[PDB]
Amino acid sequence: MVLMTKPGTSDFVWNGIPLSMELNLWNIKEYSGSVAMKFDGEKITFDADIQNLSPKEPERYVLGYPEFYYGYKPWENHTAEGSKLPVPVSSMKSFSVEVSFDIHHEPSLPLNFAMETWLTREKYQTEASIGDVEIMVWFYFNNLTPGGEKIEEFTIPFVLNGESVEGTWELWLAEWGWDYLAFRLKDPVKKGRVKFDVRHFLDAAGKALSSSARVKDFEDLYFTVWEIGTEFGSPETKSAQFGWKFENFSIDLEV
Numbered sequence: 001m002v003l004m005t006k007p008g009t010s011d012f013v014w015n016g017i018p019l020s021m022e023l024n025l026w027n028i029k030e031y032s033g034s035v036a037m038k039f040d041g042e043k044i045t046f047d048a049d050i051q052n053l054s055p056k057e058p059e060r061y062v063l064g065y066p067e068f069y070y071g072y073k074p075w076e077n078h079t080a081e082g083s084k085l086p087v088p089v090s091s092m093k094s095f096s097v098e099v100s101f102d103i104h105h106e107p108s109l110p111l112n113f114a115m116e117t118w119l120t121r122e123k124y125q126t127e128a129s130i131g132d133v134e135i136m137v138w139f140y141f142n143n144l145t146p147g148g149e150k151i152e153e154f155t156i157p158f159v160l161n162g163e164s165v166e167g168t169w170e171l172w173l174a175e176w177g178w179d180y181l182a183f184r185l186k187d188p189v190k191k192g193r194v195k196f197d198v199r200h201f202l203d204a205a206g207k208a209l210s211s212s213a214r215v216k217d218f219e220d221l222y223f224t225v226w227e228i229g230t231e232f233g234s235p236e237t238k239s240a241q242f243g244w245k246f247e248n249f250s251i252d253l254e255v
């Protein structure tokens with residue numbers, strides 16, 4: 001049983017898979033109230049009821065990203081032992097990720113249910129910079145838009161509640177200190193079960209970045225991690241009540 005009630009990181013093992021969970025309030029300067037993240041062997045849950053919020057940097061827009069992840073998160077220079085990542089993008093034949101989720105939140109709160117990876121030039125960087133790429137996949141959003149601008153749409157299949165469907169995904173792109181790409185599902189899902197192959201998003205990102213002057217040799221980058229969580233808040237958010245539950249998690253990485 002893992003229980004955290006303040007920002008921090010703990011490793012755990014779920015269905016035989018080594019993982020890290022981070023009660024991540026990375027852009028919050030100060031807060032009052034409670035946060036609690038728990039793994040009990042069957043599910044990971046997160047709940048927050050916080051007030052007196054202010055951002056460390058309003059230019060980054062969101063306030064936090066409570067999440068769990070598989071692999072090496074560059075910003076925290078951390079990976080649980082036993083992960084198959086990082087591996088070069090070119091060595092990934094397929095990477096299926098499956099998870100059930102139930103997300104709740106007060107109506108006005110900016111929030112998403114987003115998964116992501118960081119593709120870096122070296123295997124164990126401690127930050128992303130020019131030449132690196134952040135790729136997100138958003139299954140749900142409320143009062144929150146990705147960064148950058150919407151440039152394209154892609155039709156990418158996934159299995160929703162056990163049924164294969166064709167999702168329509170908008171691709172937003174931004175050139176900041178690193179390249180940011182976010183694929184946002186046009187029909188957001190707040191609760192359900194999803195299974196998909198991360199390779200389809202890598203393939204679409206490689207194409208979208210094929211003419212970039214910043215990103216070179218996309219397939220030689222290292223696919224470092226796979227994070228699953230909920231970003232939340234905006235620079236005007238003063239209090240936040242929300243939570244989530246993740247269950248039935250599995251992955252199949254073919255390298």
Ligand SMILES: OC[C@H]1O[C@@H](O[C@H]2[C@H](O)[C@@H](O)[C@H](O[C@H]3[C@H](O)[C@@H](O)[C@H](O[C@H]4[C@H](O)[C@@H](O)[C@H](O)O[C@@H]4CO)O[C@@H]3CO)O[C@@H]2CO)[C@H](O)[C@@H](O)[C@@H]1O
Nearest residue numbers: 024026059060061062064065075134144145146147148231
């Ligand atoms: O930086 C170190 C820190 O990173 C954390 O990971 C962050 C990424 O750094 C961050 O790029 C990403 O957040 C995006 C978010 O998806 C967008 O919704 C938001 O969009 C804004 C945009 O910025 C505005 O220009 C526009 O007008 O409005 C939209 C919203 O409507 O842009 C942000 C930029 O932050 O999210 C990742 C997770 O939060 C790591 O988790 C942490 O450990 C690191 O310390």
